[PDB]
């Protein structure tokens, strides 16, 4: 559900510019994914 | 601008094909100016040939332009002769340096290609640009004493 | 595309070798430190990274040798002249009507200006020309003159 | 004509390199990234609080 919001940021893109700001927006999109690992804890298939 | 220095007019060139409009003047500092006489404003100094790059290292002792092609003129300043074009600021062909300075030099009235320089060393040296652009066509000792002027039969 | 790159890369490597051959012909022609430095400036934006740079390394050594010959030749003209200027002989380095004192300074200036034009050009060249021992020998000579 | 155009390009090239060049560029981009990282960290906490 959190990645569907992250994908919404990318899927919305109309293929114009993006890469200029998305390169900036990528680092935080990664920082969210890391925090997702800690929060669930019992997250089954954490290596898959 | 504001900087106005009076510099000695060392050589003057004038031709029929150029017409009574243009007078091509060489200076002590090494530059070459052009004075277009007007019936309007008493005189105007239009072009400044070698304000920057073309500046001769010594005074411009002789200017001349080819009778065959009057667009192209040479100026025989210090060690090294140079060739110019009737608008452009910088010289087209610089031709070597030489043993001692050059006093004078002129185009062949007949032939556009070849032009004759005279050195203060004593030698005359000919540059025939039809054949070769790198080296001298032939050099010739005239006198042990220096050469102060050359003129060719028109 | 990877196959189409390899085909294009081979055509470019053949093209870069033809350019290097054309530059070497054009350099063996001008036969003036000024004319040759002017040629480089035309292709200054047209250097094809290391393949042209390998040719330039050899070219750089030839320029340093040419400037030594002119610098040595000026030194030989200065020594002969210096005698005549102080003497104030007929057929002197002093050109036409000048003072016998100011004429020397203008003469000396004209020589000093001739030598100083290539050095301001040599500083602009990359590929550690300053680190090369050949360049260092020219600079040491220049300073003494 | 050509040598002058290339000499003009060298003048324009010196500017293009050091005319649009501004002191402290990479550090400012890192500070912008940090504020976005903290915003995403606050959003995931809000998404944790919803469930």
- What phi, psi does B124 have (nearest 5°)? -95, 145
Is there a contact between B98 and B80 (Cβ–Cβ < 8 Å)?
Answer: yes
DSSP for residue D19:
T
Interchain pair B134, C96: CB under 8 A: no
Q: Do chains D and C touch (3 or more CB pairs under 8 A)?
A: yes
Euclidean distance between CA atoms C118 and C120, whole angstroms = 6
Which residues in chain D touch residue A36, judged by CB atoms under 8 angstroms apart? 44
Confirm or reject contact between A3 and chain D (CB < 8 A). Answer: no
Euclidean distance between CA atoms B121 and B107, whole angstroms = 21
Residues 6 or more apart whose CB falls under 8 angstroms from that of C100 comprise C88, C94
Q: Which residues pair with B32 in a beta bridge?
A: B26, B49
Residues 6 or more apart whose CB falls under 8 angstroms from that of D22 comprise none
Is there a contact between A2 and D44 (Cβ–Cβ < 8 Å)?
Answer: yes
Is there a contact between D35 and A30 (Cβ–Cβ < 8 Å)?
Answer: no
Euclidean distance between CA atoms B152 and B145, whole angstroms = 20
Q: Which segments within B3-54 are labelled E, that is strand?
A: 9-13, 24-27, 32-36, 44-49
Euclidean distance between CA atoms C66 and C63, whole angstroms = 5
SS3 at position B102: strand
- As a whole number of Å, the end-to-end CA separation of chain C is 60
Which residues in chain B touch residue D1, judged by CB atoms under 8 angstroms apart? 88
Burial of A18 (0-12, 13-18, 19+ CB in 10 A): middle
SS3 at position B11: strand
Q: Name chain B's partners: 3 or more CB pairs within 8 A.
A: C, D
Is there a contact between B132 and C29 (Cβ–Cβ < 8 Å)?
Answer: no
Q: Name chain D's partners: 3 or more CB pairs within 8 A.
A: A, B, C
Euclidean distance between CA atoms C93 and C108, whole angstroms = 10
Closest CB to D40: pick one of A1, A32, A39: A32
Torsion sign over Cα B136, B139, B145, B147: negative
DSSP for residue B68:
S
- As a whole number of Å, the end-to-end CA separation of chain D is 73
The structure tokens listed for B25 are 């003047």
Q: Pick from B95, B53, B50, B103: which is nearest to B78 by CA? A: B103
DSSP for residue B3:
-
Euclidean distance between CA atoms B56 and B125, whole angstroms = 20
Q: Do chains C and A touch (3 or more CB pairs under 8 A)?
A: no
The structure tokens listed for C106 are 């203008």
| C103-117 b/e (C-beta count within 10 Å ≥ 16 → b) | bbebbeebbeebbee
The structure tokens listed for A23 are 């390169």
SS3 at position B80: coil
For D5, nearest residue in chain C (alpha carbons) = C42
List the Cα angle B74/B76/B80 in 5-degree steps.
110
- What phi, psi does B106 have (nearest 5°)? -145, 150
Euclidean distance between CA atoms C37 and D1, whole angstroms = 17
Interchain pair B145, C32: CB under 8 A: no
Q: Which residues pair with B76 in a beta bridge?
A: B81
Locus of tokens 């006198």 = B143
Helical residues (DSSP H) of chain C, grouped into ranges = 2-30, 33-42, 50-87, 102-122, 133-144
**Technique used by the depositors:** cryo-EM
Euclidean distance between CA atoms B25 and B31, whole angstroms = 9
**Which residues of chain B are at the D interface, by a Cβ-Cβ cutoff of 8 Å?**
88, 90
> How many angstroms separate the most distant Cα atoms in chain D?
73
Q: After which residues is chain A broken (C to N over 2.5 A)?
A: none
Entry resolution (Å): 8.0
Q: Which residues pair with B141 in a beta bridge?
A: B123
């Amino acid at each position: 559900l959190f990645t569907l919001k992250d994908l919404f940021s990318k899927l919305q893109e109309s293929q114009p510019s993006d890469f200029p700001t998305l390169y900036e927006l990528f680092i935080p999109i990664m920082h969210t994914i890391l925090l997702i690992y800690n929060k669930s804890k019992t997250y089954n298939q954490p290596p898959r | 601008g504001e900087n106005e220095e009076i510099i000695g007019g060392t050589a003057l060139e004038y031709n029929v094909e150029a017409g009574p409009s243009k007078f091509l003047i060489g200076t002590e500092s090494g530059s070459i100016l052009t004075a277009n006489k007007k019936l309007k404003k008493p005189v105007e100094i239009t072009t400044r040939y070698g304000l920057d790059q073309g500046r001769h290292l010594g005074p411009v002792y002789s200017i001349n332009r080819s009778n065959q092609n009057p667009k192209y003129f040479l100026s025989v300043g210090d060690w090294s002769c140079k060739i110019w074009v009737e608008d452009l600021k910088t010289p087209i062909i610089r031709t070597k340096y030489h043993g001692s300075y050059l006093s004078d030099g002129c185009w062949s009235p007949t032939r556009s290609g070849a032009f004759f320089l005279v050195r203060r060393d004593g030698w005359m040296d000919v540059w025939d640009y039809y054949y070769r652009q790198n080296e001298i066509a032939f050099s010739h000792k005239v006198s042990d004493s220096p050469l102060t002027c050359i003129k060719i039969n028109q | 595309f990877d196959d189409d790159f390899y085909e294009f890369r081979s055509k470019i490597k053949e093209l870069e070798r033809r350019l290097a051959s054309v530059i070497t012909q054009g350099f063996d022609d001008y036969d003036t430190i000024y004319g040759r430095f002017k040629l480089l400036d035309n292709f200054e934006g047209l250097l094809t990274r290391p393949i042209i740079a390998d040719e330039l390394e050899k070219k750089h050594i030839v320029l340093l040798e040419m400037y030594k010959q002119d610098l040595k030749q000026v030194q030989s003209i200065f020594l002969e002249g210096k005698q005549f200027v102080d003497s104030m002989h007929e057929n002197a380095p002093l050109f036409l009507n000048m003072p016998p004192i100011a004429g020397a300074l203008t003469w000396c200036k004209s020589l000093r200006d001739r030598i100083q034009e290539p050095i301001e050009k040599l500083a602009q060249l990359g590929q550690g020309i300053t680190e090369r021992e050949e360049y260092k020998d020219v600079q040491k000579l220049y300073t003494s003159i | 004509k050509n040598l002058e155009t290339i000499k003009k390009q060298q003048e324009l090239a010196k500017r293009q390199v050091q005319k649009d060049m501004g002191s402290q560029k990479e550090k400012w981009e890192k500070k912008k990234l940090e504020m976005i990282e903290t915003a995403e960290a606050s959003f995931h906490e809000n998404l944790a609080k919803n469930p």
